[PDB]
Amino acid sequence: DVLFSNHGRVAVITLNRPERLNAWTTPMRETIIDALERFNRDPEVAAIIMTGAGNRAFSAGQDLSWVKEWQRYYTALRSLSKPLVMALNGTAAGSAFQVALLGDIRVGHPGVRMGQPEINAGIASTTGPWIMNAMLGMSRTIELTLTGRLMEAEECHRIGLIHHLVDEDKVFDKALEIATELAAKPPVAMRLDKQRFREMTEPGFIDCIEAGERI
Amino acid sequence: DVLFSNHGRVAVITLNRPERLNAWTTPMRETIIDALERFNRDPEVAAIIMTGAGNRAFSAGQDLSWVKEWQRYYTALRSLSKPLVMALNGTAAGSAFQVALLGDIRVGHPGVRMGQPEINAGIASTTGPWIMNAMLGMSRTIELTLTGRLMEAEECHRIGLIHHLVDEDKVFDKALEIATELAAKPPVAMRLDKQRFREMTEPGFIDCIEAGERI
Amino acid sequence: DVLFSNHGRVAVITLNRPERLNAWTTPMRETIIDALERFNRDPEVAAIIMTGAGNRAFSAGQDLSWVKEWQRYYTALRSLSKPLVMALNGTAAGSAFQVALLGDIRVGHPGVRMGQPEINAGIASTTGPWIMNAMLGMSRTIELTLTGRLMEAEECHRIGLIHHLVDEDKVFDKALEIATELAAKPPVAMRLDKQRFREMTEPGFIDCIEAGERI
């Protein structure tokens, strides 16, 4: 399940499979994709928050019970013309780490861990390294990718992945306050700014999609 | 007004509209462009400092009383074969933030704020994001661009934008001392190094110029 | 001289010209190149450590007693399908700084300095700036390249160049422990991950090789 709500002109997506640490299934992604495509044209909606249920995980990534449907999710996140805030209520690992990094702004709390443990399951990584490098450069990215380690919140914040660290019980309010502030920016400049970020990163995104079929 | 001086073989450009927080006008930029083109062939001149007058601002950016003439300024800064030190006597915002980041080395003091508040005036940004990303990666850049916030000096220094933080009254001396040290480097290796930085960043620079007409 | 050893399935390359601060000569590089090409197909070998002899330097860089043979070394380091850990027993300067940064993981201790002092000898730099920028962005890179300064260990670690700082006498054990942990990762995902890092950086590598003939 995924929940949808609004807080004034801010649409909220809550990942809601807490007993599976909000791990992704294909129907959850299909629903989130549709919602992302609506919020984007929807006039009630000036910004978007994604968050997870409970206090253990934003999302653990793939339910341990194709590369194209994933590309369709990444593409729907990259297409937004409106600001997207990640309210990290806990750990974001694997494909959830990637989704979190496709948000505009990240807020977490001190128990949030982030990273990409795919190598330990024998999965070769293409999307993660692209996105991590575009934010961190090749030295952090290589170590993160080959170790598969989860970084603590403080490290995430210090290297620029988490923009705000607050008390666990304030994560959502801080996320709302940021989303509200970004909702107030002039919409044309917002859309054009976001389109510009997309264009700057598009060749690298295409490259790692194509590297993904192959590899 | 803009002032020109020399301190031995170091040419100094002082931005001198203090009552307007050294905000840029078209005649100031025209004059600075000419000076930058002379200092580059001038044999008396082994390095260059830019600084602003007074203690409130390096520059506030555009006088609140085209994209091509701006491109001509950026191009004149990128063309130098000689080292360019930014003595940040105060805040560098908007297009002044960009100019500051086209220097080789930045020196400031603890009250210096930096950033790009263009979104709050409904201006879409193309140059800023290019330059910020080339130094900071996409996570800091996106947040800086969509918030339009001014960063404090300590943040600027910690993330690598400001190379030296010193006492407000030492900013210019530290700038001179750095410029003097760089003036002493072998000139051929300096010019070739600087040409190499230009070549590494040129495709991204072209891209954001062309994105600028469009957007 | 260069020493070769194994610690279980970890091959170890020790740079062994301590009286010349392990500065590179052409026969040392020729030997290291061959060893790197063997370890890569060798079935006994799941990971590789490079380190230097003594306690003053990993390597000082070029023996102060062509750009193609160097490119052959860089290419042999980039070709590994197996993890490469840099046990930094001391300072890595000039071309040794570059080699160190072509490792996957770096471990040092608090007296390790790193950087590129080439400008002070009138050498123009192309490889260094490429690699430093891919890890650090253009602001740190420009300052490092034009100053030619050596950074302290703590700075290296904070900006992400050194992954682990430990006591001088623990550097090698920490390097072994990391190399052992990476040796245990599934080999196919390791090789594919490393090939992916190579592909992401290959155009920039080609560009700076070609800039190297010219410049």
Kindly list the structural domains of chain C, giving each domain's residue range(s) and its CATH number in brackets, ordered by start. 1-215 (3.90.226.10)
CA closest to C131 among chain B residues? B200
- Cβ contact B146–A185 (<8 Å): yes
Amino acid, single-letter form, for residue B213: E
Tokens of A191: 């859309």
- Cβ contact C188–A137 (<8 Å): no
Interface test with B, best of A88, A196, A201 (most B CBs within 10 A): A196
Neighbour tally for B3: CB within 10 Å: 11
Q: In whole angstroms, what is the distance from residue C92 CA to residue C60 CA?
A: 6
CA closest to A138 among chain C residues? C135
Residue C153, CA distances (Å) to A53, C92, C173 in order: 42, 11, 18
Task: Answer yes or no: are the C-beta atoms of A197 and A80 closer than 8 Å.
Answer: no
Neighbour tally for C147: CB within 10 Å: 22
Q: How far is C105 from chain B (nearest CA, A)?
A: 21
Q: How far is A122 from chain B (nearest CA, A)?
A: 28
Closest residue to C160, CB basis, from A124, A130, A140: A140
Residues in A touching B211 (Cβ below 8 Å): 196, 199
Closest residue to A137, CB basis, from B118, B137, B145: B137
Task: Answer yes or no: are the C-beta atoms of C81 and C43 closer than 8 Å.
Answer: no
Nearest of C123, C1, C134 to residue C67 by alpha carbon: C123
- Cβ contact B125–A201 (<8 Å): no
Strand, helix or coil at A45?
coil
Q: In whole angstroms, what is the distance from residue C131 CA to residue C205 CA?
A: 8
- Cβ contact B193–C145 (<8 Å): yes
Label residue A44 exposed, middle or buried (CB < 10 Å: 0-12, 13-18, 19+).
exposed
- Cβ contact B129–A163 (<8 Å): no
Please name the chains neighbouring B, where neighbouring means 3+ C-beta pairs under 8 angstroms.
A, C
- A15 membership: H or E segment, kind and range: strand A10-15
Q: How far is A60 from chain C (nearest CA, A)?
A: 20
Closest residue to A137, CB basis, from C136, C163, C196: C136
Through-space distance between the first and last CA atoms of chain A, rounded to whole angstroms:
31
Query: Dihedral sign, CA of A149, A150, A152, A154?
Result: positive
Interface test with B, best of C135, C146, C147, C157 (most B CBs within 10 A): C146
Task: Answer yes or no: are the C-beta atoms of C7 and C45 closer than 8 Å.
Answer: no
Residues in B touching C148 (Cβ below 8 Å): 185
CA closest to C133 among chain A residues? A137
Q: Which residue, chain included where needed, has tokens 């004034």? A: A8
The answer for C94, left when phi > 0, alpha when psi is -120 to 50, beta otherwise, is left
Q: In whole angstroms, what is the distance from residue A137 CA to residue C136 CA?
A: 6
Closest residue to B189, CB basis, from C123, C140, C159: C123
B18: Cβ contacts below 8 Å, ≥ 6 apart: B52, B53, B54, B56
- A19 membership: H or E segment, kind and range: none
Q: How far is A112 from chain B (nearest CA, A)?
A: 17
**Structure solved using which method?**
X-ray
